[PDB]
Amino acid sequence: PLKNLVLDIDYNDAVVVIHTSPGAAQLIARLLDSLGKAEGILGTIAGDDTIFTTPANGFTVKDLYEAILELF
Amino acid sequence: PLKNLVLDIDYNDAVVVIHTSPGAAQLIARLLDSLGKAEGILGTIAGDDTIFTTPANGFTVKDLYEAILELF
Amino acid sequence: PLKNLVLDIDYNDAVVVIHTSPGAAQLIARLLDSLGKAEGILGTIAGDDTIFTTPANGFTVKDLYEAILELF
Amino acid sequence: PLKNLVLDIDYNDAVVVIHTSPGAAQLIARLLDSLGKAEGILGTIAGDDTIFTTPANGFTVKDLYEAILELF
Amino acid sequence: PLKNLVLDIDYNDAVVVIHTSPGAAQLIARLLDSLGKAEGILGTIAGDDTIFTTPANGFTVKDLYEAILELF
Amino acid sequence: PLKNLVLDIDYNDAVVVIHTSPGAAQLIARLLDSLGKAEGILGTIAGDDTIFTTPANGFTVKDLYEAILELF
């Protein structure tokens, strides 16, 4: 489960986009689950090797790209 | 699948997120698909128990979180 | 894989949103995955049969739209 | 999640098959998981709205079909 | 949505198994969905690019193979 | 990626049933996807925390159980 499964992070005006080794998704996404709104995550969606993630109120897409790039 | 399978509903600049009792996500998702552009629901995608819905042009997030929150 | 399966393609101030025929999302979502960050594809999370895709920093939602419509 | 989201229950010589209402698969799926091997469930895989469920190993399919049937 | 997508069809003494060009999985799945109990299918479950489909009793998996092939 | 994501492995007559830590479902089935009829995995449909894999012709569920065990 080592996060070498992570193949790319990125973020725009709306959401943070982590891409993964074919089949990570739900594992890498299960991880971000620990962060919650308090740690800057409003929600999270997985899908194939694509995971979105829009920041909670009080955090910016960047605030997010940061503390997440942090838990990685 | 009582609305009460909905653990929460918050939003942000881009999307209105719902969080469900494990596995209910898509059942609630199927409910949103009943509204569509009609009610300013341009699109909606479910994951684990995290919904990601987004407003139609001429609609805002508060408007969404106002009409989904009204459906529940 | 004929793109008549794509019921809708439309957008908002946040992501392009394609509506496909029952169960076509995961397929159509394969094409959008081909474009990559090179064409402004920041991400594409598929779902039931609704596809959420968003613009790589540098492009606009409105500029990804016209583009999908094109590589479609 | 009232068990009227199920539409039918059947079984052949290898799995119990629950065909449910749109997008309810995950939930009813969510229920059977509480009856691990001990009550006869070696495994269960949910879907679109169909559910495969197979017997532990001391329970014929018929054994499982019944237990399930009782469980709802 | 052309049946050029179906990359494989063989069966064992339990379920028939369709293999595809990744993605179709779901689309392909939903077509079989037209056969029903009556045409010999008790159910179907799919995902990535594999479709499992088991015969309704009174049908031998062999008898399903010839029926799915009679769609495909 | 590590195989300590597999929470158990059992089987019977039809399909082998491998469980896993939350999310791990998909990833682990990958290793599997790299088995082929050659080794005896006729197909593997997995989802959530259960991977069902079935044996190809000429391989007992036990013999395939074997396969996963060595490959695992």
UniProtKB/Swiss-Prot annotation, chains A, B, C, D, E, F:
Record lineage: Bacteria, Pseudomonadati, Pseudomonadota, Gammaproteobacteria, Enterobacterales
Membrane spanning residue stretches: none
Outcome when changing A25V: Defective binding to arginine and to ARG box
GO CC entries: cytoplasm; transcription regulator complex
UniProt keyword terms in alphabetical order: Amino-acid biosynthesis, Arginine biosynthesis, Cytoplasm, DNA recombination, DNA-binding, Repressor, Transcription, Transcription regulation
Compartments (UniProt record): Cytoplasm
The protein's name in its UniProt record: Arginine repressor
GO biological process terms held by the UniProt record: L-arginine biosynthetic process; negative regulation of DNA-templated transcription initiation; plasmid recombination; positive regulation of DNA-templated transcription initiation; protein complex oligomerization; regulation of arginine biosynthetic process; regulation of arginine catabolic process; regulation of arginine metabolic process
Functional summary from the UniProt entry: Negatively controls the expression of the four operons of arginine biosynthesis in addition to the carAB operon. Predominantly interacts with A/T residues in ARG boxes. It also binds to a specific site in cer locus. Thus it is essential for cer-mediated site-specific recombination in ColE1. It is necessary for monomerization of the plasmid ColE1.
GO terms of molecular function: arginine binding; cis-regulatory region sequence-specific DNA binding; DNA-binding transcription factor activity; identical protein binding
Assembly and binders: Homohexamer.
Similarity annotation: Belongs to the ArgR family.
Full-length numbering of the shown residues: 81 to 152 of 156
Taxonomic source organism: Escherichia coli (strain K12)
